Ligand binder design. Structure first.
Ligand code: CLA
Ligand code: CLA
Ligand code: CLA
Ligand code: CLA
Ligand code: CLA
Ligand code: CLA
Ligand code: CLA
Ligand code: A86
Ligand code: DD6
Ligand code: BCR
Ligand code: BCR
Ligand code: SF4
Lengths: 80, 49, 731, 167, 122, 185, 36
């Protein structure tokens, strides 16, 4: 399974969540930013590692980071 | 095995290096036996795995 | 850890064929393995080193055995200039009758001719018979068994060394300087005086009679009385016939200089004296560091004391001792860098200062040895930089090295990389421009408009060493110079005879073609260095990927975001620099080979005139010399060069196949393999059989590596076939 | 404290006086790196026993009755190796190898160094004081024989006199 | 129906470079490495479908289905904690009023104040 | 004894092979002894056929244009007729052995101890019974004990024949002939 | 028996038998589900 971390520079724009093709990410309440929400990755077992979430993230540097790791059927995107 | 070994000798007998010698058929049979041994090794290790 | 590879849980759980590939590719990266400790890491490395040394000694014993058993070494010894030395016999059932006959020319049975120079070296060091070679082979086989036993033993619990033993710098350095180098050099001098020199003077000294055959009639009395000049009196005369007693002297240590007149190689007395002085220097050097006896230096104190008082180096060398000691990757990088320099020096000095009897007459062997050692040097240099980059990723601690020279390199990496880029661009622009200008003016039939710079600085260096052709009256080319008056006392006469002898390779005559090719070589060196240095210095991060160190030395990319990040890792810099290393070493070896082929062919002027434009290289080097190689087999028959013709085409094919991995990338192949899986699952009588490892396309990094390996193997095999076949089929 | 054999040096910690023949002689500190002295003592005993037999053989094959035979007649121990032939040296090597490999687990084991079982029933009616005395005597004989073998060899290839030829 | 059935797999998460088993498990608890097709009258693996007179396409027969009742029931079972949270914040019988008045999916989708508004009606 | 410790340590060092009966097992001792006995038969037949010149054109070499490069020893020098004939006889025996290894019948003594074969338990029982330095003089006739003893004798004879032929500086056929009182040549 | 026979004896063993058994052994090892 891949690792997906959210750093506290997240501004809760929800763009990574909308970008995710396998629904790894979700928005949760948080008082650290103006939007009152932060990204979360509770379902990293379904992360393929496409990094669309990172492409969508507007902060500098990224607030969501995908580190590729141990491959499974799910992370390899296999229909077989 | 009966189906395959019968046709496997043909390529060896008719096209192998010794095809133009008078022991060409015997060499073709030996080549077929060698191929069968290779295939049997494949079957054995396949079953084990 | 329940399946292969047991050292990686992450890989062992992958359900695809990837699990196998990566296991194989990660077996020797012991630091990354699950549950590894530092102590176990050092112990496993120690045992693996014993195994590697066993492999080396098995290889040497095998060369000795095959020459003794199947070679013509005795016939070669009796007649060096008219025998082709044998490497080993051929037994290949695929051969036709014509092939057997072709490969048995000059012999009764098919053979490969050796181009490794082993016969010349063994002849020079005193080997004369097959029995002696066989005894050497047996000894090395037993020594390999001993090394394997040692490797096994030092993995047993009571014999595993501790981490403190592996980190004892002063003692290891003392022993490797004084014992591994200094005493080995002394023992080699002893061999040369007792065995090789008498053999060159037509006298047999072996295990049967060496205790009662003094290597000098005066014995060891002069050595112990300090009257050492006795060992230099009466050298071999200028009419000395090697391997016979005619014209022989009795000197065992000399400083004659130059070459033996008949072998055109270094005097054996000169080499013995060289190794004796070397032994003294290294034994002395090996007493510098403090081990157990109160005296000697501590390396940490030496390092910490060297900070310039002005401060232009910041903290100086403080922190480097711990950094080097705790980082196997930095140690390996230093070892590979120095080994690369030493291998290049081996290649450069062996061709010019021929050490082995009759080696300069074996043209193909000369070409093969130079090319072999230069390619190995390139690989070693690339490795040195790769392990520097790995050190930066995995071992470098910014706080331990705060403000030292190592950290200040990182602090001005932008200036370093930009200036290296400027130098590379300048060299490329002007060297390619001069080549193209020459090509164009020659194409329009006006060769007098060529730009032909004379390599004046190098010619001045040659003159300074005594070369008289360039009309520079400087230093050793000047009769009245202090250097000449001093040097004439010891080595200058022989050296001057060799250097002003055009039949030798001692400082070959150079001209404008040498100038242009040298600037091309500098381009290759600078660009290869630029790629490797930028990879090492950006291994930890860059503006495009500021957290690169969190992702490791090798990783595919960081995705298509931020404009695209393909080939961003430091491993990718290694991968790019492999192409430039191969191209550079190719330019170097092409230059060496073409200059030597024109010299050996009796027409240096062809190189001197045609090397100044690219078409001269394409036409007069590659096209012209391809001829015997491409006719090794043809519609009319074959000869013994047919194997090289086949290997030439083989190399072209492997190189081109590497192009497939390098150009086409993963997504295409993964989609194709999806349809392959569909087909197999849906095919009756074949779907009785199923894979247990899901077929997947090769990974991004794996494909880069596979393409690079195919490219490199094809490059090497193609050039080896060309150099061997062209040199051996022409001369 | 201090070493008994070299009274101005400190004894290394491993030379506690338990093993027979210990007089605190290890000036080079060779015992400090080893985990224990069992392998070292096995080696010392094996070398010494071989040297004892080698010295005895050097004397007998020079001033003693050889076995009948043309090959077995020469009194020169170095030449004996070649004269008796490979067919006999190899049998000796193989039998020794069988004895060595059968005792492999003792050599790399934790039992008493030197004791492969060939006791002769000599140490049955003894306490530990007498067994210690016997082991001290064996180790002293081993140590004398190694020096003696070095001497004997260097007198038969550096001077080419006999062993009992004191001219 | 157990909710951790997915998590009870044989995947042992590595100590590094591994996100582990997330909300549902990293992989199926069923070993995918099963036998190929089998002769007429035989089964390749435990739960394999009998391909009848065409065993070579036996793997194209489906033994895994989702009937609508199982879908509704697992929807309720997997979201029981979210519904418990929503009633905990809006505030047994009240939940039965809300989830039958408007729906279960709608009850999940609405807000505690909005449900305080719909609870106004009776 | 040294034997039990030796076998146990070998099994601990090579467990995958020790599972099938490879290595210093009773199974390997039995099979190699059977082969040694048959090979004593074959070697005696070869000695007898060489002594009486019953092999046609023994010193003549095979035709290169007939058998090709595979029949060459060095270059175009081909193997003799006698060596090829001996090889072919042993190849007959080897084909029998390969058929037995690959396709054993259910009541057959298999080469390796396969848990799925119907003879596995019988094989383990028999192999547990056999063992010791002296052959069981209580058990005679056609029994596993006698088979093991005679296999051991045949392997010992092979070793001694190789060693004696080496010491005497003669060929193994010469030793075989001089051990039967020159009954072959 | 002579050493001159060794190539035609040994080459098929090194180039055919040994790679086949080594590849079969490695295949069996990589397909093993519990190695330790
Ligand atoms: C790939 C193309 C190709 C082809 C067609 C051949 C063909 C041949 N090679 Mg060559 N060779 C090749 C490439 C090829 N080679 C390569 C790449 C190399 C390495 C460089 C060699 C090196 C080589 C050597 C050293 C030798 C040969 C030899 C031969 C000949 C004998 C081979 C043999 O008996 O195989 C046996 C063939 C089989 C066992 C099976 C063939 C495939 C079957 C017929 C397919 C049937 C499918 C069926 C129609 C499907 C439906 C059936 C039904 C159920 C519906 C034969 C003419 C030998 C020779 O002497 O040449 C004269 C020989 O000594 N080759
Ligand atoms: C004097 C005693 C002694 C000796 C003979 C050795 C010898 C060796 N040790 Mg060392 N070692 C020693 C003491 C000694 N050690 C001590 C006291 C320690 C503990 C402090 C160690 C700890 C140690 C470790 C941890 C390791 C070794 C290893 C080795 C081996 C290195 C590889 C090799 O074989 O290359 C031999 C090479 C040569 C003989 C030729 C060297 C020539 C090179 C290329 C330099 C040439 C430069 C040239 C002369 C001039 C410069 C060129 C310039 C002009 C450009 C070698 C056998 C390694 C090994 O592989 O063990 C299995 C290893 O991992 N040792
Ligand atoms: C740098 C040092 C050095 C090197 C590299 C050489 C190299 C050589 N010497 Mg020279 N020599 C040297 C120093 C050196 N010598 C010194 C200091 C002297 C005394 C002055 C000599 C005197 C000398 C003589 C008289 C002869 C040589 C010969 C040779 C050549 C063959 C040696 C041989 O048989 O290899 C094989 C290797 C060995 C013999 C040594 C290793 C033996 C192994 C370790 C045995 C294993 C022992 C172990 C107990 C085995 C059982 C256990 C195991 C099975 C597990 C070889 C080129 C011979 C020759 O042919 O010259 C042309 C020769 O006759 N040398
Ligand atoms: C003393 C020499 C030395 C040592 C001890 C090491 C040790 C190491 N290297 Mg380094 N390295 C070296 C020299 C050395 N290297 C050189 C000379 C180079 C330049 C090429 C490199 C470049 C390099 C890179 C880029 C990397 C390493 C890495 C490593 C580590 C992992 C190695 C591994 O698992 O791969 C094992 C590899 C194999 C088991 C297979 C090797 C593939 C071979 C070449 C294919 C053979 C060619 C083909 C069969 C020929 C075809 C023949 C034809 C006729 C058909 C290990 C610590 C890796 C690392 O991550 O370190 C942390 C890593 O990424 N090395
Ligand atoms: C023969 C093919 C070739 C050529 C000419 C180049 C050239 C270059 N490489 Mg490249 N490289 C190549 C193959 C090649 N590479 C391959 C196969 C790889 C493996 C992927 C690489 C990987 C690589 C890396 C990793 C790096 C380079 C770098 C460079 C630059 C080095 C500095 C230099 O020489 O500047 C001089 C410029 C040239 C020689 C090219 C200009 C050619 C002519 C003279 C220009 C003419 C312009 C023309 C008039 C305008 C167009 C006309 C019309 C269309 C309008 C140079 C541009 C490095 C770099 O960027 O350094 C600054 C660098 O880091 N290369
Ligand atoms: C082990 C005890 C031992 C004994 C009793 C002897 C006894 C002797 N040695 Mg020997 N020797 C020995 C060990 C011994 N050696 C050792 C360890 C070495 C170093 C290798 C030598 C090296 C040596 C040399 C070089 C010579 C003697 C000589 C002698 C004889 C001269 C007497 C004397 O020592 O003054 C005497 C028979 C002299 C002699 O004539 O030998 C026959 C002589 O020249 N010895
Ligand atoms: C490591 C060096 C080495 C290499 C590359 C070779 C290569 C070869 N040998 Mg030679 N061999 C060697 C050492 C070597 N040998 C030694 C030291 C001996 C004395 C025991 C022999 C005894 C020998 C005989 C009697 C014959 C050969 C033959 C051959 C050829 C066919 C292969 C074969 O059937 O051999 C079989 C080899 C053996 C039975 C013994 C092999 C011993 C070496 C040490 C194994 C090396 C292992 C190696 C280092 C592992 C690393 C490689 C791997 C990582 C890729 C081939 C050219 C045959 C030939 O000449 O055909 C024309 C042949 O008849 N070899
Ligand atoms: C299976 C079983 O259980 O059975 C049992 C039975 C049994 C009997 C109980 C057993 C035992 C005990 C054994 C084997 C005992 C053997 C003991 C032995 C043979 C002990 C002396 C060696 C030589 C020495 C000390 C020489 C000093 C030599 C000196 C001091 C010299 O100067 C030598 C010399 O060369 C030079 C240096 C200089 C030259 O100028 C001349 C001379 C010659 C002078 C075993 C092992 O338990 C086995
Ligand atoms: C005691 C023990 C030690 C041990 C030991 C010692 C010395 C062990 C000895 C081992 C040695 C003595 C074992 C030889 C067997 C003879 C072979 C198998 C004969 C095959 C003969 C058969 C296979 C071949 C027959 C043919 O070839 C023939 C005849 C003619 C051909 O036409 C036909 C055939 C192919 C059929 C350790 C292990 C060192 C340490 C441990 O701690 C203690
Ligand atoms: C990255 C990195 C790394 C790497 C590095 C490298 C790889 C390097 C290389 C380098 C090099 C590779 C260098 C070289 C150098 C050289 C030199 C420096 C030389 C000099 C010389 C001289 C000085 C000479 C002189 C002379 C004489 C003596 C005589 C006369 C002549 C003349 C004058 C010439 C490491 C690991 C560290 C770590 C960190 C990171
Ligand atoms: C198959 C067959 C068969 C069978 C057979 C068999 C059963 C065999 C056996 C065989 C055998 C069974 C063999 C054996 C051999 C033996 C030998 C040959 C031996 C020798 C030895 C020796 C020489 C010895 C020595 C010694 C020792 C060791 C010790 C002590 C001393 C002495 C000296 C005595 C028959 C014919 C029926 C029929 C046909 C077929
Ligand atoms: S991680 Fe980036 S894309 Fe996702 S919510 Fe935070 S700021 Fe937006």
């Amino acid at each position: 399974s891949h690792t997906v971390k959210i750093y506290d520079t997240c501004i809760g724009c929800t763009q990574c969540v909308r970008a995710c093709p396998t629904d790894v990410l979700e928005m949760v309440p948080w008082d650290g930013c103006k939007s009152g929400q932060i990204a979360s990755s509770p379902r990293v077992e379904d992360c393929v590692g496409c990094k669309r979430c990172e492409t969508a993230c507007p902060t500098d540097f990224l607030s969501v980071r995908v580190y590729l790791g141990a491959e499974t059927t799910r992370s390899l995107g296999l229909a077989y | 095995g009966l189906a395959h070994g019968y046709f496997l000798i043909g390529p060896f007998a008719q096209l192998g290096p010794l095809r133009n010698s008078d022991i060409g058929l015997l060499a073709g049979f030996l080549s077929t036996i060698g191929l069968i041994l290779i295939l049997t090794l494949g079957l054995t290790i396949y079953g084990a795995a | 850890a329940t399946k292969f590879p047991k050292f990686s849980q992450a890989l062992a759980q992958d359900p695809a064929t990837r699990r196998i590939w990566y296991g194989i590719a990660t077996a020797h990266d012991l630091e990354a393995h699950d549950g590894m400790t530092e102590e176990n890491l050092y112990q496993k490395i120690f045992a693996s080193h014993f195994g590697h040394l066993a492999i080396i000694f098995l290889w040497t014993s095998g060369n000795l055995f095959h020459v003794a058993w199947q070679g013509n070494f005795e016939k070669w010894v009796s007649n060096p200039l008219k025998t082709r030395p044998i490497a080993h016999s051929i037994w290949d059932p695929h051969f036709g009758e014509s092939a057997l006959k072709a490969f048995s020319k000059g012999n009764t049975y098919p053979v490969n001719i050796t181009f490794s120079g082993l016969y010349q070296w063994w002849y020079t060091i005193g080997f004369r018979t097959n029995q002696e070679l066989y005894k050497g082979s047996i000894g090395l086989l037993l020594l390999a068994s001993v090394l394997l036993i040692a490797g096994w033993l030092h993995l047993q619990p009571k014999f595993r060394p501790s981490l403190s033993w592996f980190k004892n710098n002063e003692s290891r350095l003392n022993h490797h300087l004084s014992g591994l180098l200094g005493f080995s050099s002394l023992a080699w001098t002893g061999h040369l005086v007792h065995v090789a020199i008498p053999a060159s003077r037509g006298v047999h000294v072996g295990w049967d009679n060496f205790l009662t055959t003094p290597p000098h009639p005066a014995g060891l009395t002069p050595f112990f009385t300090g009257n050492w000049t006795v060992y230099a009196e009466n050298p071999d005369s200028a009419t000395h016939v090697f391997n016979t007693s005619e014209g022989s002297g009795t000197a065992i240590l000399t400083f004659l200089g130059g070459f033996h007149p008949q072998t055109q190689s270094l005097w054996l007395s000169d080499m013995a004296h060289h190794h004796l002085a070397i032994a003294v220097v290294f034994i002395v050097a090996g007493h510098m560091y403090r081990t157990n006896f109160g005296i000697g230096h501590n390396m940490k104190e030496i390092l910490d004391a060297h900070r310039p008082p002005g401060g232009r180096l910041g903290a100086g060398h403080v922190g480097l001792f711990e950094t080097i000691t705790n980082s196997l990757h930095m140690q390996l990088g230093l070892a590979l860098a120095c080994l690369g320099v030493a291998t290049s020096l081996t290649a450069q000095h062996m061709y010019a200062l021929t050490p082995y009897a009759y080696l300069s007459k074996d043209f193909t062997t000369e070409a093969a040895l130079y090319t072999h050692h230069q390619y190995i040097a390139g690989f070693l240099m690339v490795g040195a930089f790769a392990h520097g980059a790995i050190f930066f990723v995995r071992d470098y601690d910014p706080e331990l090295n705060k403000n030292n020279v190592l950290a200040r390199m990182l602090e001005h990496k932008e200036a370093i990389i930009s200036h290296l880029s400027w130098a590379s661009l300048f060299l490329g622009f002007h060297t390619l421009g001069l080549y193209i200008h020459n090509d164009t003016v020659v194409a329009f039939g006006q060769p007098e408009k060529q730009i032909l710079f004379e390599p004046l600085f190098a010619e001045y260096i040659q003159a300074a060493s005594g070369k008289a052709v360039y009309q520079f009256n400087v230093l050793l080319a000047s009769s009245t110079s202090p250097a000449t008056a001093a040097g004439n006392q010891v080595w200058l006469p022989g050296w001057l005879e060799a250097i002003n002898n055009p039949k030798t390779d001692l400082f070959l005559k150079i001209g404008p073609g040498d100038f242009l090719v040298h600037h091309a070589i500098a381009l290759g060196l600078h660009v290869t260095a630029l790629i490797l240095v930028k990879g090492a210095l950006d291994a930890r991060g860059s503006k495009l990927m500021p957290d690169k160190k969190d992702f490791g030395y090798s990783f595919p990319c960081d995705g298509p975001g931020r404009g695209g990040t393909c080939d961003i890792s430091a491993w990718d810099a290694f991968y790019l620099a492999m192409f430039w290393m191969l191209n550079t070493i190719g330019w170097v070896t092409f230059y060496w080979h073409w200059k030597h082929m024109t010299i050996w062919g009796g027409n240096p002027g062809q190189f001197d005139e045609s090397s100044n434009y690219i078409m001269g290289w394409l036409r007069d080097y590659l096209w012209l010399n391809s001829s015997p190689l491409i006719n090794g087999y043809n519609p009319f028959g074959m000869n013994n060069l047919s194997v090289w013709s086949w290997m030439f085409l083989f190399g072209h094919l492997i190189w081109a196949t590497g192009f497939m991995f390098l150009i086409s990338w993963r997504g295409y192949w993964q989609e194709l393999i999806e349809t392959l899986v569909w087909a197999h699952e849906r095919t009756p009588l074949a779907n009785l059989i199923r894979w247990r490892d899901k077929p997947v396309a090769l990974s991004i990094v794996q494909a880069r590596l596979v393409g690079l390996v195919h490219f490199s193997v094809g490059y090497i095999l193609t050039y080896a076939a060309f150099v061997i076949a062209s040199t051996s089929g022409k001369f | 404290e201090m070493s008994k054999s070299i009274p101005f040096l400190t004894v290394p910690e491993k030379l506690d006086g338990s093993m027979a023949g210990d007089v605190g002689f290890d000036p080079m500190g060779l015992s400090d790196i080893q985990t224990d002295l069992n392998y070292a003592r096995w080696a010392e005993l094996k070398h010494g026993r071989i040297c004892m037999l080698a010295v005895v053989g050097m004397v007998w094959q020079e001033y003693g009755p050889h076995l009948p035979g043309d090959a077995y007649a020469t009194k020169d121990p170095w030449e004996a190796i070649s004269s008796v032939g490979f067919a006999s040296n190899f049998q000796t090597l193989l039998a020794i190898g069988v004895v060595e490999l059968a005792n492999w687990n003792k050599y790399y084991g934790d039992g008493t160094p030197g004791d492969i079982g060939w006791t002769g029933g000599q140490l049955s009616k003894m306490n530990d004081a007498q067994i210690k005395t016997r082991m001290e005597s064996e180790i002293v004989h081993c140590r004398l024989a190694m020096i003696a073998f070095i001497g004997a060899t260097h007198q038969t290839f550096l001077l080419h006199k006999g062993l009992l030829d004191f001219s | 129906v157990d909710l951790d059935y997915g998590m009870k797999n044989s995947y042992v998460p590595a100590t590094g470079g591994d996100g582990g088993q997330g909300q549902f498990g990293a992989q199926s608890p069923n070993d995918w490495r099963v036998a190929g097709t089998s002769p007429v009258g035989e089964t390749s693996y435990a739960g394999a479908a009998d391909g009848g007179e065409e065993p070579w396409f036996a793997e194209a027969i489906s033994t895994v289905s989702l009937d609508l009742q199982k879908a509704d029931e697992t929807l309720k079972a997997f979201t029981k904690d979210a519904a418990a949270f929503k009633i905990e914040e809006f505030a047994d019988a009240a939940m039965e009023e809300l989830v039958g008045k408007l729906g279960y999916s709608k009850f999940l989708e609405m807000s505690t104040k909005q449900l305080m508004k719909t609870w106004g009606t009776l | 004894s040294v034997f039990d410790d030796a076998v146990k340590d070998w099994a601990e060092e090579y467990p995958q092979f020790a599972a099938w009966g490879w290595g210093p097992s009773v199974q390997a001792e039995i099979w190699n002894g059977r082969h040694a006995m048959f090979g004593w038969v074959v070697m005696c037949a070869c000695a007898y056929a060489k002594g009486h010149g019953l092999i046609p054109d023994a010193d003549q070499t095979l035709d290169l244009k007939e058998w090709g490069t595979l029949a060459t020893i060095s270059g175009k020098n081909t193997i003799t007729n006698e060596r090829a004939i001996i090889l072919i006889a042993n190849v007959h025996a080897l084909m029998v052995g390969l058929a037995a290894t690959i396709s054993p019948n259910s009541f057959a003594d298999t080469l390796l101890l396969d848990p799925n074969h119907p003879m596995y338990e019988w094989q383990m029982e028999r192999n547990s019974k056999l063992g010791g330095v002296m052959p069981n003089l209580g058990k005679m006739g056609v029994t596993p004990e006698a088979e093991l003893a005679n296999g051991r004798m045949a392997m010992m004879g092979i070793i001694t024949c190789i060693a004696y032929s080496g010491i005497q500086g003669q060929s193994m056929i010469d030793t075989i002939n001089e051990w039967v009182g020159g009954a072959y040549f | 028996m002579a050493a001159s026979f060794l190539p035609s004896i040994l080459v098929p063993l090194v180039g055919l038998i040994f790679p086949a058994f080594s590849m079969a052994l490695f295949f069996l090892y990589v397909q093993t589900d519990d190695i330790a």
